[PDB]
Coordinates of C-alpha atoms and ligand atoms in Angstrom, one line a residue:
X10 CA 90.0 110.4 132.1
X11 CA 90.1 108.7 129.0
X12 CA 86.8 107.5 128.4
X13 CA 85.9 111.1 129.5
X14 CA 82.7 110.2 131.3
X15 CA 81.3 107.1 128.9
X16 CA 80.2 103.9 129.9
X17 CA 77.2 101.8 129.6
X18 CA 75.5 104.3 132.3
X19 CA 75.9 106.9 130.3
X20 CA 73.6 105.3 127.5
X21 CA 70.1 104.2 127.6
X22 CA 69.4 100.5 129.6
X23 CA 69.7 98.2 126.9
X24 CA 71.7 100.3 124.1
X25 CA 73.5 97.8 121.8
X26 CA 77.1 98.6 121.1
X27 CA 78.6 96.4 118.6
X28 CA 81.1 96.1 115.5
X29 CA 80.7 95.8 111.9
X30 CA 81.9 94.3 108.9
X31 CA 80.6 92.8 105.4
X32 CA 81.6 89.8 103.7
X33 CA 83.5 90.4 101.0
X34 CA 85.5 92.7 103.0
X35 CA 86.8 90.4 105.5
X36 CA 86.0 86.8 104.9
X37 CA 88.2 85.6 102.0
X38 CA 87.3 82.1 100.3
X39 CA 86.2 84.6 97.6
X40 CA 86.5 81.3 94.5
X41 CA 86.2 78.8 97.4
X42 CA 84.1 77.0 99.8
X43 CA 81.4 77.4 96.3
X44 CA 80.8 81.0 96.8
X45 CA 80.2 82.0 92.9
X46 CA 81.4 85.3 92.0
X47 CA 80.2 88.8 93.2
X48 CA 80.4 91.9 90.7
X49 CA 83.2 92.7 93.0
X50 CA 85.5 89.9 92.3
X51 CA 84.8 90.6 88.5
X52 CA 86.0 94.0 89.3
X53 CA 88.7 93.6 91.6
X54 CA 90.3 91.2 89.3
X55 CA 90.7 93.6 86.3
X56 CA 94.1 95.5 86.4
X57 CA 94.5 98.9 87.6
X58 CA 90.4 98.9 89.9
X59 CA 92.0 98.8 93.1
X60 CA 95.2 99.9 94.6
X61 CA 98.2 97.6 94.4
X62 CA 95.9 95.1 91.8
X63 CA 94.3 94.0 95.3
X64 CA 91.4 92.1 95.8
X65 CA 89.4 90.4 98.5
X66 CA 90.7 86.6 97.8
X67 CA 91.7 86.3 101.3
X68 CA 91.1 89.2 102.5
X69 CA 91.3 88.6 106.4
X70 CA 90.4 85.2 106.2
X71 CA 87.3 85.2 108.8
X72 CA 86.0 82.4 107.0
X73 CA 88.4 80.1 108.4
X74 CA 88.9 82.1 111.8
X75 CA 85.7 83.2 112.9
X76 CA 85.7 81.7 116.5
X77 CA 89.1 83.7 117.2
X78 CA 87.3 87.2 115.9
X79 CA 84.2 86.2 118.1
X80 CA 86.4 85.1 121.1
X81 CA 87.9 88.6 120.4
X82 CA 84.6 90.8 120.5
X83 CA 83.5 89.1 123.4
X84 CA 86.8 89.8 125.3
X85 CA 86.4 93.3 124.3
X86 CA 82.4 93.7 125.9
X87 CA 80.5 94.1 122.5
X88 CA 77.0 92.8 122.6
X89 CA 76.4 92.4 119.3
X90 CA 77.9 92.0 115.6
X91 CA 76.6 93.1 112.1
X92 CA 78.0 91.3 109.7
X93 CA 76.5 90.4 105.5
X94 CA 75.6 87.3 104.1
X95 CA 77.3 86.6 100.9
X96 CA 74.3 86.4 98.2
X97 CA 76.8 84.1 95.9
X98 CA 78.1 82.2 98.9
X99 CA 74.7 80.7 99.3
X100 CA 73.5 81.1 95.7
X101 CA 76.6 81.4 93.2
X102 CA 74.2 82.0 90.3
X103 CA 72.0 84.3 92.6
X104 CA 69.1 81.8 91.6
X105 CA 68.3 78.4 91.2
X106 CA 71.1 76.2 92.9
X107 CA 72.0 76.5 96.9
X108 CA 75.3 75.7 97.7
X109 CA 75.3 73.7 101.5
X110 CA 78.8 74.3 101.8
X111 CA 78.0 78.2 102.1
X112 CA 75.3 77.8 104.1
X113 CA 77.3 75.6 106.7
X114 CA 79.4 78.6 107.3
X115 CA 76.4 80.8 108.3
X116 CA 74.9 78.3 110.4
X117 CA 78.1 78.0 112.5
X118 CA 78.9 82.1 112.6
X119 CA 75.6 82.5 113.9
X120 CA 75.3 79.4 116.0
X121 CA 79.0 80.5 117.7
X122 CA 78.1 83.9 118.0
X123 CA 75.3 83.0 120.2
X124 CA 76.7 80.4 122.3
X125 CA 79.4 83.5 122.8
X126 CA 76.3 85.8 124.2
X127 CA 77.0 88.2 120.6
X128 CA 73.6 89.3 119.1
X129 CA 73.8 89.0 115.7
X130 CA 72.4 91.7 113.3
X131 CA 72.8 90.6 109.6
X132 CA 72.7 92.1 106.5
X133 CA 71.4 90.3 103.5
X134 CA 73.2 92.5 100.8
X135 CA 76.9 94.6 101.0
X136 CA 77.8 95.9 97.3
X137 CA 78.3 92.2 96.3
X138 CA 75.7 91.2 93.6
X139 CA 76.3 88.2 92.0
X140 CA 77.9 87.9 89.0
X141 CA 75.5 85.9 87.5
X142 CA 73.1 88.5 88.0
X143 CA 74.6 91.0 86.4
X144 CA 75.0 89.7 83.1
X145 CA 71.6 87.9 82.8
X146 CA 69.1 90.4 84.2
X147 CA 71.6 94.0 84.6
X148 CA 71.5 94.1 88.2
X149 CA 70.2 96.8 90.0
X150 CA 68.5 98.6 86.7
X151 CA 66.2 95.7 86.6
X152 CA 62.8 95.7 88.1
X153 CA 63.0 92.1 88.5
X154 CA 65.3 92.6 90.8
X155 CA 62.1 92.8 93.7
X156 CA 61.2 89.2 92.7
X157 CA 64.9 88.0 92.3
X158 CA 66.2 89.4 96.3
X159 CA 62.6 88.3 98.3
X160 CA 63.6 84.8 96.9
X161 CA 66.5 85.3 97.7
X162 CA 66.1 87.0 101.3
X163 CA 63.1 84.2 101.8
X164 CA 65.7 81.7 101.9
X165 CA 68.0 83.6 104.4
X166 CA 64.4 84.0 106.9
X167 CA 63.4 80.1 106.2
X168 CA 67.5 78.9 107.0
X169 CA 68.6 81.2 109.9
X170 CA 65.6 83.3 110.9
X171 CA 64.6 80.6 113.6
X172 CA 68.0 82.4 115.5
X173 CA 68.2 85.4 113.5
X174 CA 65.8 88.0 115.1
X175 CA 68.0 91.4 113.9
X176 CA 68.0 91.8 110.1
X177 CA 68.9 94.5 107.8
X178 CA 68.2 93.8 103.8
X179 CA 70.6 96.5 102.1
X180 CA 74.2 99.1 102.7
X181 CA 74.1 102.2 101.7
X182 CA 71.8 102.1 98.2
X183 CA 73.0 105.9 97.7
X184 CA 76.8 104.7 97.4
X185 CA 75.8 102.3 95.0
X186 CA 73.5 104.8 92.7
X187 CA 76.1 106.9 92.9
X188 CA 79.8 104.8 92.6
X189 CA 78.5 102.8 90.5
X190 CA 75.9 104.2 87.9
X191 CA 76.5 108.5 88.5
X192 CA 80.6 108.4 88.6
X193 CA 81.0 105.2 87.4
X194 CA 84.0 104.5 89.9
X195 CA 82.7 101.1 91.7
X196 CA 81.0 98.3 89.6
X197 CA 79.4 98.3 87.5
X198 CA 81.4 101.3 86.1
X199 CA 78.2 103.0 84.9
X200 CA 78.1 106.5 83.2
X201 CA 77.4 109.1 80.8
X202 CA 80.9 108.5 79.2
X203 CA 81.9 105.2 80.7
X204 CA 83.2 102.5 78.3
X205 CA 80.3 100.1 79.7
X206 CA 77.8 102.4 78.8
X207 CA 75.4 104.5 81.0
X208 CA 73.7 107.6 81.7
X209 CA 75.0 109.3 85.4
X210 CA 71.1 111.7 85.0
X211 CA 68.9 108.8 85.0
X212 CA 70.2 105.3 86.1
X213 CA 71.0 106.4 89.4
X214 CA 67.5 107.0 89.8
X215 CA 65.8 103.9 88.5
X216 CA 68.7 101.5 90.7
X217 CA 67.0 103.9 93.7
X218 CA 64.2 102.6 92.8
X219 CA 64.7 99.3 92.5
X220 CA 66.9 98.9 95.8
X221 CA 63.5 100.7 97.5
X222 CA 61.0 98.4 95.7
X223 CA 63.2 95.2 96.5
X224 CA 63.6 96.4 100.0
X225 CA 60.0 96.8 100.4
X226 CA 59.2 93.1 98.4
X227 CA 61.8 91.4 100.8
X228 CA 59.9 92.8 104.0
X229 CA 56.7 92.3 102.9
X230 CA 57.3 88.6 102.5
X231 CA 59.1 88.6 105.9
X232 CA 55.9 90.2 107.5
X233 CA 53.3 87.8 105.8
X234 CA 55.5 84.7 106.0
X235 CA 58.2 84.8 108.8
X236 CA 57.3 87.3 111.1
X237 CA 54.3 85.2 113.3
X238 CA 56.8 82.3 114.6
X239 CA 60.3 84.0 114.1
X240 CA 59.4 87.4 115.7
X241 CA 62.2 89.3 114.3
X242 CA 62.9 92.8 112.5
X243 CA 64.1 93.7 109.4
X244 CA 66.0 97.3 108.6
X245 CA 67.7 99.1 106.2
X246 CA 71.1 101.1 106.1
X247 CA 71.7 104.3 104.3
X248 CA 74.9 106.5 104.6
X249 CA 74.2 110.2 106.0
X250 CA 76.7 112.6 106.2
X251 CA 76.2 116.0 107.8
X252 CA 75.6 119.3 105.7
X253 CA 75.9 122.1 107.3
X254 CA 74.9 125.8 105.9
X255 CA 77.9 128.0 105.1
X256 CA 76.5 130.6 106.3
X257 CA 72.6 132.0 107.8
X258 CA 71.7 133.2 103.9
X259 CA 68.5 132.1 102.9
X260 CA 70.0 130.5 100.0
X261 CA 72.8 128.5 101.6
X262 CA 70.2 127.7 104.3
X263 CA 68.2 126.2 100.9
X264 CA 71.2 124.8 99.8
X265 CA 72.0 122.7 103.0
X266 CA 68.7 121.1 102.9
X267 CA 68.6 120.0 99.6
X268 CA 71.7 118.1 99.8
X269 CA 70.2 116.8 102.8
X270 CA 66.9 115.9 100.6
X271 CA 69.2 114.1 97.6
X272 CA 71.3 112.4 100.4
X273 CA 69.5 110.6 103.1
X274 CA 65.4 112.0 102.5
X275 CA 65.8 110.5 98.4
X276 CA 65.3 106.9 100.8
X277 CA 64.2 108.3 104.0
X278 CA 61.0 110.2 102.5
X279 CA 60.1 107.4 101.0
X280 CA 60.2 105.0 103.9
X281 CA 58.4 107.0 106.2
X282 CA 56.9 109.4 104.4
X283 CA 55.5 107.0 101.3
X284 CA 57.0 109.5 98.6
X285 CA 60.2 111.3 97.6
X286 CA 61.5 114.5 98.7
X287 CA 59.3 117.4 97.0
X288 CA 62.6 119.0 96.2
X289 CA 63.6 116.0 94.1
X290 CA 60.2 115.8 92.6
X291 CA 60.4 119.3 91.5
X292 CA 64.4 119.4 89.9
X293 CA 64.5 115.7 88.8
X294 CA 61.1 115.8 86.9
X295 CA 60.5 113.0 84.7
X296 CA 63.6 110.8 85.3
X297 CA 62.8 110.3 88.8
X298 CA 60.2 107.3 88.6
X299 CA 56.9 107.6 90.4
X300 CA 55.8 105.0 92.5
X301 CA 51.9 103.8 92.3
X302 CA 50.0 104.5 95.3
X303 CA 50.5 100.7 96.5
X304 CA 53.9 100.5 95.7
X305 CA 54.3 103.8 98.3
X306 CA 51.9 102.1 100.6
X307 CA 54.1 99.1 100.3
X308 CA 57.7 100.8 101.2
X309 CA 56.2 103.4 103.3
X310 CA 57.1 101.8 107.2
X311 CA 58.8 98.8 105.7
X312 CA 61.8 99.7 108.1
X313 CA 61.5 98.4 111.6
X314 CA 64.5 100.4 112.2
X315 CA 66.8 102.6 110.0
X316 CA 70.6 102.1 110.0
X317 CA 72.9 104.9 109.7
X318 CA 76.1 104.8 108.6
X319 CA 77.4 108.2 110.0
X320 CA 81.2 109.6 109.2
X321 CA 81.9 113.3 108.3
X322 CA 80.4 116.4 107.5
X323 CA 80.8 119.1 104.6
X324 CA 79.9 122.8 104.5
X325 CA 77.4 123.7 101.4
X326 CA 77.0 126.9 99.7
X327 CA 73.7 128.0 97.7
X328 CA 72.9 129.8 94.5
X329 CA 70.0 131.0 92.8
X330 CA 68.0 127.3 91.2
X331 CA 69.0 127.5 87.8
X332 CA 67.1 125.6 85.1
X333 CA 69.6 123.4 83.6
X334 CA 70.2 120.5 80.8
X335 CA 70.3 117.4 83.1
X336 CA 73.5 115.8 83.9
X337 CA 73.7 113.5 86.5
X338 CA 72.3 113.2 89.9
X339 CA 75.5 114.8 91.5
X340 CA 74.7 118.0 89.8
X341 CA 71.1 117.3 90.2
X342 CA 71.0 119.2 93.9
X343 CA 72.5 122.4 92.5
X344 CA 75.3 122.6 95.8
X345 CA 78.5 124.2 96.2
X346 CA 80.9 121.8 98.7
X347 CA 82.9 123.6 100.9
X348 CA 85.4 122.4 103.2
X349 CA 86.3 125.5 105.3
X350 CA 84.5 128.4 107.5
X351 CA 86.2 131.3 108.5
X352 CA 89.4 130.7 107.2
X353 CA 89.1 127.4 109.4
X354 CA 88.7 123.6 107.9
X355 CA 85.5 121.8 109.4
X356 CA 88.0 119.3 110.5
X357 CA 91.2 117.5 110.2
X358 CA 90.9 114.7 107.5
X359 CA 91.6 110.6 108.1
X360 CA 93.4 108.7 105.8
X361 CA 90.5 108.9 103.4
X362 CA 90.1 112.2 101.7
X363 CA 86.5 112.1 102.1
X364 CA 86.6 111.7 105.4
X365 CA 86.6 115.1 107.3
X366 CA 86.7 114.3 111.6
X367 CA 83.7 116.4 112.7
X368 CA 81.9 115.1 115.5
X369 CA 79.3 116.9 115.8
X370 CA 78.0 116.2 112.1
X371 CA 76.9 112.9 114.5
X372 CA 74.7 115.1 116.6
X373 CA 73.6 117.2 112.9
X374 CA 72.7 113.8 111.4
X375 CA 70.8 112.2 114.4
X376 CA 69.1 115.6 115.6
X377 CA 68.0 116.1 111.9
X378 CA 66.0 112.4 111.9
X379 CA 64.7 113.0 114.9
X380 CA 63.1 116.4 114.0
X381 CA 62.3 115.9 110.8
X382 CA 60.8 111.8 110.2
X383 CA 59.1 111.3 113.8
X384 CA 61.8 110.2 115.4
X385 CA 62.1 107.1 114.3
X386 CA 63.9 104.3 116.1
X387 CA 67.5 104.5 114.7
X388 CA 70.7 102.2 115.0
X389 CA 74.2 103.5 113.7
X390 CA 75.2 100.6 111.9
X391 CA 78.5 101.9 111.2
X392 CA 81.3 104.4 111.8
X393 CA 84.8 104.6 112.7
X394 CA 87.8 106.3 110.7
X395 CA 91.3 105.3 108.5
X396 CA 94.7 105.1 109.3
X397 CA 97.0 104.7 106.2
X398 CA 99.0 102.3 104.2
X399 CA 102.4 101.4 105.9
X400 CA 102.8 101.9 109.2
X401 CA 104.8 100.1 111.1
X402 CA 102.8 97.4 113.7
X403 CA 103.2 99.3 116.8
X404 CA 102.0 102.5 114.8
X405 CA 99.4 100.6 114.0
X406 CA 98.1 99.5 118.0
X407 CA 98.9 103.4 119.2
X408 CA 95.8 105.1 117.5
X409 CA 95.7 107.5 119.6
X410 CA 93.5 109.5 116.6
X411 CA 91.2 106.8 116.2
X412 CA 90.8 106.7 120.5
X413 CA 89.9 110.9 120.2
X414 CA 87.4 109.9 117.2
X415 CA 84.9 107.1 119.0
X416 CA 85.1 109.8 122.1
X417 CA 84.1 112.7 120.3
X418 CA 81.3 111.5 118.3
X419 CA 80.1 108.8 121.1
X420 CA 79.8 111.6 123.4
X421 CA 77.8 113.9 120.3
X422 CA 75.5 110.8 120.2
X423 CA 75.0 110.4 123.7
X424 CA 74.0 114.5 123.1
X425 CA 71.4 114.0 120.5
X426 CA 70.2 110.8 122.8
X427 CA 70.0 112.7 125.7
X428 CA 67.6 115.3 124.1
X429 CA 65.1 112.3 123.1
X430 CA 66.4 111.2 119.9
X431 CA 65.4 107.4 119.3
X432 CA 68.2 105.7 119.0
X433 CA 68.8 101.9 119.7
X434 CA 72.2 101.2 119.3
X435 CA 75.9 101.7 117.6
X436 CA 78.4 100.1 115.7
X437 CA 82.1 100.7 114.9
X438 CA 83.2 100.4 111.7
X439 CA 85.0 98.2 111.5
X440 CA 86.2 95.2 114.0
X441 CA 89.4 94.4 111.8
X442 CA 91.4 96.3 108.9
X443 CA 89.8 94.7 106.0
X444 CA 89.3 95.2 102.2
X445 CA 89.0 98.5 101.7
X446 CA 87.1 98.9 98.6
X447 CA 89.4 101.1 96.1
X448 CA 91.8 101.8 98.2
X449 CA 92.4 97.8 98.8
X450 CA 94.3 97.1 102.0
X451 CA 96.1 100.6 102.2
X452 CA 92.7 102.0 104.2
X453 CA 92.8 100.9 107.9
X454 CA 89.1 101.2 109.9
X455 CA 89.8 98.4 112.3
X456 CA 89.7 98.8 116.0
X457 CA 91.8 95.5 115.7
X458 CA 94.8 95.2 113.6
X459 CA 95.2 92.5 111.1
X460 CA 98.7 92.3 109.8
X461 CA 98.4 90.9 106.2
X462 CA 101.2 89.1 105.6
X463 CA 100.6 86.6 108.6
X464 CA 96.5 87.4 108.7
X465 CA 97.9 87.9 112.8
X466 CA 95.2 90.0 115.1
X467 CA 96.3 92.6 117.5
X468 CA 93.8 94.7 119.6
X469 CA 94.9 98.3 119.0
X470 CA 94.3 101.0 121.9
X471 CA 90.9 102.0 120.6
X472 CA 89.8 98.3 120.8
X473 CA 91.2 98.6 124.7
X474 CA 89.1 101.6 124.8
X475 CA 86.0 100.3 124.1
X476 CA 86.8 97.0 126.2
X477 CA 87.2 100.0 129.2
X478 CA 84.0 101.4 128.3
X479 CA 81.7 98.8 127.8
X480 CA 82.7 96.5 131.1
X481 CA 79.4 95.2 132.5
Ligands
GLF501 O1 84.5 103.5 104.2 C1 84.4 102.8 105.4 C2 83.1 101.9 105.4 O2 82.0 102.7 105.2 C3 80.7 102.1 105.2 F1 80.5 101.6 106.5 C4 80.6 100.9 104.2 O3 79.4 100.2 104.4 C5 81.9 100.0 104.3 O4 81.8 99.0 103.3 C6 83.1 100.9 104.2 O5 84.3 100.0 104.3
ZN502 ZN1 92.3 80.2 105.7

């Protein structure tokens, strides 16, 4: 049968299942309504960033139609919805002045999201600093950063926290270390050779930092401030994809585990553990920064619950540690990526390149956590996979591909719940097509199509599938 075997029964009582997206990927108003700018608008705007000059203006225009996309979730038996606040929507300096307007909008997501019965789950921060910022303090490579978010996340708890009990303050810091400050590819188009200046062997590292110290700042104050009447939890969500070992050699053994260490444990370790991976410690040196015993003692179990954002899985081959002239953090973990065993690929690919369809890097990933970090309680905040650019509608609602996908690694989760794995709930990624980052609107996650020319919704056969599934 098509579900083959799913259903709320075969999850834990209780298990949330929900959708996700952020907010400058599907609400539009991006210069209205007196959201300032993001970093992202800055970018998007500049010829040649994103493909076809897009850019998330309107994007799929939830601002105006949010009460259609709840209506829609409901009708399809989700429980819950993750969605970001827009820092510059509520503060388009990022300091200083709030703007009502923005906040209004907030207030009446939330409020209609709960009059629906949808839990909401809300992220503070999605890629979209504000502009503002940027060019006063340098973002993310600026320790004031702490002090700048907990004023700003204070806010969020003192305005919606009364109904907000489900919080998450960043997505995926190792994306932006790493886009934005190793490769230089998202903003702020940081690098050894970028035109704006940079250095891919050490920035990554101190914007780390300073998404872990911020995180830790914004909880804290939660804890000593919020948490006695409001009662609520506050999370984080890092990206983790699988790596597997080539083969049963010592050193691609080695090798697997330190990409592991670099990708998810260079945040992990120190939010459970109170330090960073020894592996990092020992190949990064000097340019990775040392937290003071109370700074580790402040992030260490600041995480209520982690978020994964889970997708894909690569192979990785080892070599003998070489002592080598730094570079950047990339080259940092001394890996060769490899994308077949056996003469066989680990998987077919989606529409994005990166993304290789191997479910059971979902039971790797979730296993690993387990084994490895106590079994902490875990929530994947996010996964799902791409159709491409022009397709006709009905192509579109017949994802038959997308269908296979949520089956295939659902029923790898349910494996790694079933052996004891603490896990509290998952998220598809993502409710609608949206913005798509680089790739603009030519990148389709949605379980529900939005035709952009008439901003139209359509339930496509996966979203049908999950409706079939999660029937109370
Ligand atoms: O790449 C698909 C999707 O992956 C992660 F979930 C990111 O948080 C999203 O912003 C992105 O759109
Ligand atoms: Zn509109």
């Amino acid at each position: 049968n098509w579900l083959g075997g799913l259903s709320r029964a075969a999850f834990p009582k209780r298990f949330v299942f929900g959708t996700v997206t952020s907010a400058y990927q599907v609400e539009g108003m991006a210069a209205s309504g007196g959201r300032g700018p993001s970093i992202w608008d800055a970018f998007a705007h500049t010829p040649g960033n994103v493909a076809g000059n897009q850019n998330g203006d309107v994007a799929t225009d939830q601002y105006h139609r949010y009460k259609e996309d709840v209506n829609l979730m409901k009708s399809l038996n989700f429980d819950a919805y993750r969605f970001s606040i827009s820092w510059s929507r509520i503060f388009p300096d990022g300091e200083g002045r709030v703007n009502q307007e923005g906040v209004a909008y907030y207030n009446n997501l939330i409020n209609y999201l709960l009059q629906k019965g949808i839990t909401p789950y809300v992220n503070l921060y999605h890629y979209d600093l504000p502009l503002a910022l940027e060019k006063k303090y340098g973002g993310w490579l600026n320790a004031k950063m702490a002090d700048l978010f907990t004023e700003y996340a204070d806010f969020c708890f003192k305005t919606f926290g009364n109904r907000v009990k489900h919080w998450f303050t960043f997505n995926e810091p190792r994306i932006v270390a790493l886009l934005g400050y190793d490769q230089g590819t998202n903003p702020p188009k940081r690098c050894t050779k970028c035109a704006a200046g940079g250095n891919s062997a050490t920035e990554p590292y101190i914007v780390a930092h300073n998404f872990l110290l911020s995180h830790a700042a914004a909880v804290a104050r939660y804890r000593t401030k919020y948490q006695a009447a409001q009662q609520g939890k506050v999370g984080i969500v890092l990206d983790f994809n699988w790596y597997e070992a080539l083969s049963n050699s010592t050193e691609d053994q080695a090798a697997a585990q330190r990409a592991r260490d670099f990708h998810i444990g260079w945040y992990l370790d120190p939010l459970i553990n109170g330090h960073y991976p020894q592996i990092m410690q020992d190949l990064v040196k000097d340019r990775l920064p040392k937290f003071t015993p109370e700074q580790a003692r402040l992030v260490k179990g600041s995480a209520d619950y982690i978020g994964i954002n889970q997708y894909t899985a690569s192979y990785m081959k080892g070599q003998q540690l070489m002592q080598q002239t730094p570079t950047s953090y990339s080259a940092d973990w001394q890996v060769t990526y490899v994308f077949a065993k056996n003469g066989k690929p680990i998987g077919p690919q989606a529409n994005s390149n990166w993304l290789y369809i191997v479910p059971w890097g979902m039971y790797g990933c979730v296993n690993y956590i387990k084994q490895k970090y106590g079994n902490p309680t875990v929530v994947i905040t996010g996964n799902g996979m791409d159709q491409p650019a022009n397709l006709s509608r009905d192509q579109y609602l017949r994802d038959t591909t997308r269908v296979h996908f949520y089956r295939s690694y659902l029923t790898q989760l349910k494996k790694a719940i079933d052996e004891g794995a603490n896990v509290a709930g998952y998220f598809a990624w993502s409710l609608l097509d949206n913005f798509e980052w680089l790739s603009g609107y030519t990148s389709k996650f949605g379980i529900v199509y939005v035709d952009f020319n008439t901003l139209e919704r359509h339930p496509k056969a996966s979203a049908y599938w999950f409706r079939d599934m999660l029937k109370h």
